[PDB]
Amino acid sequence: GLSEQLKHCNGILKELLSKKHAAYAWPFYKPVDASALGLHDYHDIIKHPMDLSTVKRKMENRDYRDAQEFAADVRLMFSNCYKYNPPDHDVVAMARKLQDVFEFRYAKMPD
Numbered sequence: 838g839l840s841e842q843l844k845h846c847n848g849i850l851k852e853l854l855s856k857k858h859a860a861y862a863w864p865f866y867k868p869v870d871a872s873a874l875g876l877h878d879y880h881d882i883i884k885h886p887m888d889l890s891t892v893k894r895k896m897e898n899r900d901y902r903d904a905q906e907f908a909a910d911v912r913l914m915f916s917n918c919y920k921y922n923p924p925d926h927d928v929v930a931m932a933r934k935l936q937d938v939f940e941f942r943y944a945k946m947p948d
């Protein structure tokens with residue numbers, strides 16, 4: 838009728854986690870460890886943390902009911918990065934590059 842659109846989403850997720858994009862994807866692999874990185878304001882600024890490992894667990898557990906819900910979580914992850922980090926930080930440049938990969942492939946969703 839995973840749905841056909843959620844299989845496309847799963848394909849995108851596999852690509853975002855692949856060695857192809859690892860040079861700029863790695864900050865998004867796991868939840869931000871705020872205490873480890875000394876980001877003691879992170880959880881005051883970011884109310885809904887998101888990362889690719891959480892998206893993968895949700896996909897594996899069939900949590901997403903459609904492609905829109907999946908895309909909202911991936912975009913939440915990028916938005917958190919843009920909200921917390923200064924716009925000239927290396928992690929924001931990496932977010933922009935990984936979001937470009939995401940948005941162009943998400944746009945190729947089969948109807």
Ligand SMILES: CNC(=O)c1cc(C(=O)NC2CC2)cn([C@H](C)c2ccccc2)c1=O
Binds near residue numbers: 921926927928
């Ligand atoms: C989603 N990831 C983050 O928001 C994030 C923030 C900060 C961070 O220190 N943010 C401070 C507000 C500047 C550092 N990193 C890692 C450790 C990093 C360090 C150097 C280059 C690229 C990435 C993140 O992944």
